[PDB]
Amino acid sequence: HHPCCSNPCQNRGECMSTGFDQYKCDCTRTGFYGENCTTPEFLTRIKLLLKPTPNTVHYILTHFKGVWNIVNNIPFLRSLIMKYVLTSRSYLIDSPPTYNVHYGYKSWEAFSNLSYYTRALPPVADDCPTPMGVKGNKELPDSKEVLEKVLLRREFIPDPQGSNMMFAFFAQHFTHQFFKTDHKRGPGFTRGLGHGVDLNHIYGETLDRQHKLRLFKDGKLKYQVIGGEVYPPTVKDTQVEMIYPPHIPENLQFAVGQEVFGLVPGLMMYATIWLREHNRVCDILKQEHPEWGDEQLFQTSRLILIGETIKIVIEDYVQHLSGYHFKLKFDPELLFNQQFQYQNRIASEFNTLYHWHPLLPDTFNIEDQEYSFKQFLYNNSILLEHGLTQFVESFTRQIAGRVAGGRNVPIAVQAVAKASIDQSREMKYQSLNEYRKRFSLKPYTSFEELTGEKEMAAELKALYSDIDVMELYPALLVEKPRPDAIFGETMVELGAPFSLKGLMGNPICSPQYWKPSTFGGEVGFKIINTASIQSLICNNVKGCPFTSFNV
Amino acid sequence: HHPCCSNPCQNRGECMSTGFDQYKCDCTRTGFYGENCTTPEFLTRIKLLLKPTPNTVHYILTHFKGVWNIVNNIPFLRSLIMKYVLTSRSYLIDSPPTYNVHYGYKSWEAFSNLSYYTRALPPVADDCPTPMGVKGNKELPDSKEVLEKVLLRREFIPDPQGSNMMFAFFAQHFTHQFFKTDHKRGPGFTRGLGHGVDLNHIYGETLDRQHKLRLFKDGKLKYQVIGGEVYPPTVKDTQVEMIYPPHIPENLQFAVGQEVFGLVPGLMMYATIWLREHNRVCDILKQEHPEWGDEQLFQTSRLILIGETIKIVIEDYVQHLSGYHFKLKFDPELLFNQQFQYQNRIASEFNTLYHWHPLLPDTFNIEDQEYSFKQFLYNNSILLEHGLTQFVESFTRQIAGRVAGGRNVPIAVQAVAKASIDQSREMKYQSLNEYRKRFSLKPYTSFEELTGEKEMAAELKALYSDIDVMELYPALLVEKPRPDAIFGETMVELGAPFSLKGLMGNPICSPQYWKPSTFGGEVGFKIINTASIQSLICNNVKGCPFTSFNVQ
Ligand code: COH
Ligand code: COH
Ligand SMILES: *[C@@H]1O[C@H](CO)[C@@H](O[C@@H]2O[C@H](CO)[C@@H](O[C@H]3O[C@H](CO)[C@@H](O)[C@H](O)[C@@H]3O)[C@H](O)[C@H]2NC(C)=O)[C@H](O)[C@H]1NC(C)=O
Ligand SMILES: *[C@@H]1O[C@@H](CO)[C@@H](O[C@@H]2O[C@H](CO)[C@@H](O)[C@H](O)[C@H]2NC(C)=O)[C@H](O)[C@H]1NC(C)=O
Ligand SMILES: *[C@@H]1O[C@H](CO)[C@@H](O[C@@H]2O[C@H](CO)[C@@H](O)[C@H](O)[C@H]2NC(C)=O)[C@H](O)[C@H]1NC(C)=O
Ligand SMILES: *[C@@H]1O[C@H](CO)[C@@H](O[C@H]2O[C@H](CO)[C@@H](O)[C@H](O)[C@H]2NC(C)=O)[C@H](O)[C@H]1NC(C)=O
Numbered sequence A: 001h002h003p004c005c006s007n008p009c010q011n012r013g014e015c016m017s018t019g020f021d022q023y024k025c026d027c028t029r030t031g032f033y034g035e036n037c038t039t040p041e042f043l044t045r046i047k048l049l050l051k052p053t054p055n056t057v058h059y060i061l062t063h064f065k066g067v068w069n070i071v072n073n074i075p076f077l078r079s080l081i082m083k084y085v086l087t088s089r090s091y092l093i094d095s096p097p098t099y100n101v102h103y104g105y106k107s108w109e110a111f112s113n114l115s116y117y118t119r120a121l122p123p124v125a126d127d128c129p130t131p132m133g134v135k136g137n138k139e140l141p142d143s144k145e146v147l148e149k150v151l152l153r154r155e156f157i158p159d160p161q162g163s164n165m166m167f168a169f170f171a172q173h174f175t176h177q178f179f180k181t182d183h184k185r186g187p188g189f190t191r192g193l194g195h196g197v198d199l200n201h202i203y204g205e206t207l208d209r210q211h212k213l214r215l216f217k218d219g220k221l222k223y224q225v226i227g228g229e230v231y232p233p234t235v236k237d238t239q240v241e242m243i244y245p246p247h248i249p250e251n252l253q254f255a256v257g258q259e260v261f262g263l264v265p266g267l268m269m270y271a272t273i274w275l276r277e278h279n280r281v282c283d284i285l286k287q288e289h290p291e292w293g294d295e296q297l298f299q300t301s302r303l304i305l306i307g308e309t310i311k312i313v314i315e316d317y318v319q320h321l322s323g324y325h326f327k328l329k330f331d332p333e334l335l336f337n338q339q340f341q342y343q344n345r346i347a348s349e350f351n352t353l354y355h356w357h358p359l360l361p362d363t364f365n366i367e368d369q370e371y372s373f374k375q376f377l378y379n380n381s382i383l384l385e386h387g388l389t390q391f392v393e394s395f396t397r398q399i400a401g402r403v404a405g406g407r408n409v410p411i412a413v414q415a416v417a418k419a420s421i422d423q424s425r426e427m428k429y430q431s432l433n434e435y436r437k438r439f440s441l442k443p444y445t446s447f448e449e450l451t452g453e454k455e456m457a458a459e460l461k462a463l464y465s466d467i468d469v470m471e472l473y474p475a476l477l478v479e480k481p482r483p484d485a486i487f488g489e490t491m492v493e494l495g496a497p498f499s500l501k502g503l504m505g506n507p508i509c510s511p512q513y514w515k516p517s518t519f520g521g522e523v524g525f526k527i528i529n530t531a532s533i534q535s536l537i538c539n540n541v542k543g544c545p546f547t548s549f550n551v
Numbered sequence B: 001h002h003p004c005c006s007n008p009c010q011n012r013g014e015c016m017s018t019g020f021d022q023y024k025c026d027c028t029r030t031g032f033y034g035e036n037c038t039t040p041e042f043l044t045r046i047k048l049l050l051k052p053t054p055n056t057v058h059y060i061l062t063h064f065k066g067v068w069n070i071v072n073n074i075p076f077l078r079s080l081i082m083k084y085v086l087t088s089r090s091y092l093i094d095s096p097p098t099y100n101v102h103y104g105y106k107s108w109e110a111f112s113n114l115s116y117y118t119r120a121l122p123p124v125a126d127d128c129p130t131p132m133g134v135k136g137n138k139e140l141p142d143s144k145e146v147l148e149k150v151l152l153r154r155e156f157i158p159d160p161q162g163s164n165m166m167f168a169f170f171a172q173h174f175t176h177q178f179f180k181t182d183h184k185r186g187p188g189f190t191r192g193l194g195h196g197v198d199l200n201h202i203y204g205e206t207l208d209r210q211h212k213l214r215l216f217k218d219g220k221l222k223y224q225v226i227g228g229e230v231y232p233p234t235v236k237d238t239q240v241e242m243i244y245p246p247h248i249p250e251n252l253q254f255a256v257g258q259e260v261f262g263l264v265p266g267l268m269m270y271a272t273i274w275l276r277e278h279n280r281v282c283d284i285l286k287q288e289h290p291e292w293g294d295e296q297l298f299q300t301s302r303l304i305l306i307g308e309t310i311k312i313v314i315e316d317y318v319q320h321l322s323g324y325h326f327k328l329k330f331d332p333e334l335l336f337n338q339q340f341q342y343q344n345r346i347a348s349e350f351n352t353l354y355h356w357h358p359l360l361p362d363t364f365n366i367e368d369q370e371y372s373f374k375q376f377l378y379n380n381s382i383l384l385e386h387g388l389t390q391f392v393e394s395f396t397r398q399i400a401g402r403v404a405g406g407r408n409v410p411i412a413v414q415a416v417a418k419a420s421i422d423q424s425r426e427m428k429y430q431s432l433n434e435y436r437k438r439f440s441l442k443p444y445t446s447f448e449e450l451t452g453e454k455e456m457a458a459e460l461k462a463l464y465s466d467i468d469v470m471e472l473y474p475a476l477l478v479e480k481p482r483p484d485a486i487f488g489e490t491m492v493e494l495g496a497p498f499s500l501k502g503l504m505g506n507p508i509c510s511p512q513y514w515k516p517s518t519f520g521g522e523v524g525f526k527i528i529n530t531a532s533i534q535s536l537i538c539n540n541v542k543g544c545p546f547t548s549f550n551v552q
């Protein structure tokens, strides 16, 4: 079998076979040396001594409210802290990217072929004696067994951070521009070749699709007016392919950038809001620039909406998720005197960690109605009959599920949860502890340490035998959450680097793009820099219902 | 017309219209302010007072050989100088890239669509009253007239830097991996979607083509053995499409990564050499790694050859071109403590400036023969008859033509040279002086200042009326050269930024790739470490003939 199967190289050292039954580690720039890169250099010893734990840092950021109140009002100090948040996270990500499902060694194919998700860790070699390498049993536990014992929801567990349905649908809508798995090729492949925040879920992935969606007047996107309200156009009008089962009426077959958004009225709600927003920005640019043509109004509006998206994601969405008293800031200038790569490649493991199926409630509560999953799916009538104002008011009030802490995946989506496990194995993911070490975390030394409790730990012990062959995805869902938090440590420590990298590593954040002229002048630039989840809803939804990501 | 037509914003400030007849300049991070970004900040004044001209710096780098002897042998100083060369030149290139032929303002389409060449300056607006904006006549001079009066060769002018045919064919072979204009779509479009040194000219642009070229044993490329010599395989064997006239014998239809390389035996010489090098590197890695499969052998050899290529281009090719006494260095570590983007997008103007057709001789002199263009074209039998060893020996000794200084484009190639001008205008290139300013050179104030002589200057004055509407491509070829040099100032100050950016931007130069394990261990890494034009020929050409990029 492959000599690297045991994952011998530590501290980001690279393993390479040297003959049939021997390996060598490449310890270059790890700060360690020795056979398995485990002997620290002197400066490294000091760094290890002078480095606070993630849980310590989390404590500091979620206490001392009065101190952070001061910090948040000293522009210089807010800037300094945000600068450190961004730099320390982003260095954990390989950029330019390296491995993929087919390449456990660096190759031009892995670098150049955009159809692949990239990989934060190389796949387990095909000939390893056990699924994870050398440890554990010859077979991993039945995925159905893992799912039923520790993942599936008994009673609904609400998120203690107060995340709502506006938050849950924003997460799904936003992430589905860059998680777009190419099922015809396999779970290791994507159809989001832009690999980031390009808003293809509004504008279409291909030029062909964009052009069928565009009005070609005033920069705008095609739309319908129904009972005085602006909605997306139809599949019949535009000839834009959408996924609708055969029974949905033609009138209610809305066509948007992302072909799956008809699946859920909560996604169609955000699709409608963002369509209205593009067209609103076109109206504003048109009065700033009566001389501009349709193409420049369209392109400049797209750049503004990209900027709004990143702004909202950092200062509302990630702000809410974090639980910090520190006020995060979207400010590209923070990186202009730093080393940083303005590029991104979407990791398979980032897609996997974002399978937040426990967020979903048992029913979708709008106005006086409670819709089951069966009723809610593909049901654009629900959206037309209640309207966007009531959707916003109802979803702002409805609480979402807790993601970590176990037993909170709704049964309605049991097959999707099982697929996450099965597809992880098909893609030959390394174990939870390999991933923790890869992101500078101490491995868990027992199942009780992972879960913070005795019962699930005992089931997992019976299923996996060894903590070192525990799988990443189910671990994220059973992990001990932070105090009164939606997530545990592993989720935050892997998710944050991927997240901030893909947000700041957009070309609009680069020095050549981050200028008022890129966005049509000072008015366009101000739209980006003052954007919020509340203003997006206020500007585009009748009556300006109040909103946020909590309650 | 468009209010920015006159190019009012200076010092890399951005122009945008504000109303039908008004503009505003964006001076963000230019170091200047005021209506047209022409008032310097205080620190900018100091920099502008202190900064030596390119011609002063060229003088220093080509003189004081005694001091450079010292500097070259103190690794710390050599590293310090090379680091400055890399970073100052790279700063002039927008990365992530910005404009293209269709977009004179930043857009997601221009950023994301890899089928376009990028643009260092936006195109002149469609509605400008004048070809270059607002200056000059309503029409530019007839392109045939520019070509015949100032570009066509009267007699062969040899390169005074001593560039040879080994150099000329290396330039053509190397650059044709990334200048692959998609003539189906138009001159502002490329088929080289990798936008840099990926070696698609050896391996193929697409997976399908690569797989048809591969042996699938030992990591190797397919080959044939003719008279005991290794050559590329045929079109018939591989089913790889190549450009060849119908009458070429089956066995002479050589299939290689780049479809145009059968056009010229000098290109096929290098294709054959690099194919042999790939297979040689496969043998080395198989000896180091008897446990490796064919895929990893192939992929690792390809990364090694990319490293070899960059190494030779910097330390032999660019070194030769430069004429510097300072010894250039390929060393990715130089940038590890610097700000730098490991990515590249090929600029249309970089393609244009690299139309070095005056390099070509009047005839191709191999052994005792002198071949015309007509005889040489598509003629692989010449390669077989003389052999690679004799090709190397002959091309090492044949002088190439001077590029700058005017009147040195061979007549055989007149249609290509004319197309360079016509396509520049089709793509609405800004004037020479705009490009000079964009790259912080002082604009030329007369045609005599441009050429350094009287006669061509007078022809150009009559053709163009105004030095401010003189075009970039013909200017590059008539420019006064540096003393005893192949190129003038404009070639170097534009070309060096695009070149170094595209050499260092490659992912193999990034800290996560630049490690022995990327290249199969120390042995693969060492292959890059010692690579040179001499070792390339020595390892892959029977008899290990001497070679270099200069005649003597
Ligand atoms: C972000 C949180 C989130 C939410 C709220 C959510 C809400 C819902 C929802 C009700 C609204 C339903 C019916 C589903 C059901 C599905 N989920 Co999500 N999912 C979420 C995270 C994801 C992600 C991320 C993917 C990956 C999509 C991809 O790769 O194509 C996913 C994949 C899927 C797929 C496609 C299979 C696959 O490609 O893996 C289905 C079907 N699921 N999910
Ligand atoms: C590096 C210097 C150099 C040399 C020595 C050289 C020598 C020769 C040569 C040898 C006898 C022949 C037959 C030609 C013939 C041509 N060259 Co060059 N060319 C050179 C630089 C270029 C470049 C760069 C292009 C643009 C290629 C592109 O855009 O595809 C080019 C374009 C062409 C074209 C137009 C088609 C195309 O590829 O775009 C023809 C025809 N030519 N040239
Ligand atoms: C990158 O930019 C290219 C230039 O815009 C673009 O090529 C263009 O693609 C469009 C859309 O497919 C073609 O327009 C089509 O429109 C109708 C069909 O609705 C047909 O009648 C047309 O003939 C044509 O198919 C353009 O013809 C085409 N322009 C070209 C080839 O110069 C690329 O699509 C862009 N690349 C990507 C990945 O988006
Ligand atoms: C920066 O921009 C240029 C505009 O190109 C210059 O405008 C010139 O102003 C003169 C006013 O007397 C005109 O005679 C001249 O026609 C005009 N140039 C053109 C081509 O329109 C501005 O004055 C200059 N501004 C500053 C502050 O230097
Ligand atoms: C990126 O990689 C994929 C997977 O190897 C390539 O898809 C294959 O393409 C080949 C050659 O055309 C086909 O024979 C296979 O059917 C494809 N395999 C699949 C879809 O899994 C794809 O071509 C690559 N992309 C590029 C631009 O090279
Ligand atoms: C290098 O790391 C490797 C891999 O973990 C170590 O390999 C061995 O260590 C064990 C303890 O001495 C041996 O009994 C085993 O044969 C082997 N490990 C396994 C289970 O594969 C090695 O000790 C490390 N070397 C150094 C210098 O620490």
Ligand SMILES: CCCCCCCCO[C@@H]1O[C@H](CO)[C@@H](O)[C@H](O)[C@H]1O
Binding pocket: B148, B149, B150, B152, B153, B154, B455, B456, B459
């Ligand atoms: C060598 C290719 C033929 C060019 C001839 C047509 C254009 C004539 O051009 C003329 O050529 C003369 C001789 O070089 C010069 O003295 C003139 O300055 C030039 O205008």
Ligand SMILES: CCCCCCCCCCCCCCCC(=O)O
Binding pocket: B085, B089, B313, B318, B321, B322, B491, B492, B495, B496, B497, B498, B499, B500, B502, B503
């Ligand atoms: C990537 C191809 C390299 C070819 C270079 C094209 C135009 C000449 C550039 C090199 C000029 C010589 C000096 C180089 C070092 C420097 O001054 O930055």
Ligand SMILES: *[C@@H]1O[C@H](CO)[C@@H](O)[C@H](O)[C@H]1NC(C)=O
Binding pocket: A375, A376, A379, A381, A382, A385
């Ligand atoms: C979808 O939801 C509507 C609410 O508008 C509900 O009345 C209906 O039963 C559902 N659609 C059908 C007929 O399946």
Ligand SMILES: *[C@@H]1O[C@H](CO)[C@@H](O)[C@H](O)[C@H]1NC(C)=O
Binding pocket: B374, B375, B376, B379, B381, B382, B383, B385
């Ligand atoms: C090609 O070169 C050969 C020498 O190898 C020469 O004899 C022949 O005439 C050339 N072919 C043509 C068509 O000119």
